[PDB]
Amino acid sequence: PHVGNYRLLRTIGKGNFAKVKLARHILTGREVAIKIIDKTQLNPSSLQKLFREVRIMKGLNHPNIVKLFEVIETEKTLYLVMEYASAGEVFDYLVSHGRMKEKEARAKFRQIVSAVHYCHQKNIVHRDLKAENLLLDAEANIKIADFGFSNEFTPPYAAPELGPEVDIWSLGVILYTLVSGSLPFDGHNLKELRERVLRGKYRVPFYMSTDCESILRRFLVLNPAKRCTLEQIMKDKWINIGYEGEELKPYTEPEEDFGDTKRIEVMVGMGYTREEIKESLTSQKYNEVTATYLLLGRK
Known part of the structure; x- marks a missing residue:
């Protein structure tokens, strides 16, 4: 008790x-x-x-x-x-409540990118970003968890290789799931999920914007060597639609x-x-x- x-x-x-x-x-x-x-x-x-x-x-x-x-x-x-995180995981929200509109997706994906950058800037890599560590508070705000633990804690969202590039991929997958509502590289068995993740080939639904497709490409590059840096991706056009005089910046602590x-x-x-x-x-x-x-x- x-x-x-x-x-x-x-x-x-x-x-x-x-x-x-x-x-x-x-x-x-x-x-x-x-x-x-x-x-x-x-x-x-x-x-x-x-x-x-x-x-x-x-x-x-x-x-x-x-x-x-x-x-x-x-x-x-x-x-x-x-x-x-009272509201729970994000993908139980995406199955239940469906896909998110690019406005809502943008909002949540900013919070993500802010948090992951700040943590990269303190040389921390989650390397396990996935369904279970992306959470939401009462006020529908992202809460990333177990970021920096290597514990057993409590494959789709992971790269074709398997520091910071392991998460860049992961963010790309998450962005897709946010806007689309479904996993990019899903399936039944795990010999299947390799073929799809390793090709990186996804489907682009009709409702996904060209700008959104474009930023998705920046994240999901098959060579980590060419993948875009969060520093840069904060300046992406898509990420800052509706945030004109509020261009996303690296989080600085109070x-x-x-x-x-x-x-x-x-x-x-x-x-x-x-x-x-x-x-x-x-x-x-x-x-x-x-x-x-x-x-x-x-x-």
């Missing part, structure tokens, strides 16, 4: 070595997801990469990337407390705002101290205090 300052609700996945549970922060009331890894059943050399990745994850601060809130360690279990008196007053009323709060936010130790500060500004 309880972990940290979090009441546990219901399980929402069970990968290899990791299981995610939906939860409810008692102090603030807000809603969160919690990845639970058993350290028991781990190669000690892997923990050197687990925590290494947890370091990167703390550095991720983008509106379309799942933010870390609190870390809770016991010698047995690691609890990672994250954002919950300043620290660790001095919100109104939140601190509340936290003081929760039993924390001014010193505890200051020490905790500065050191960025992702403790009960840092979490409570972030959740208190979430909505």
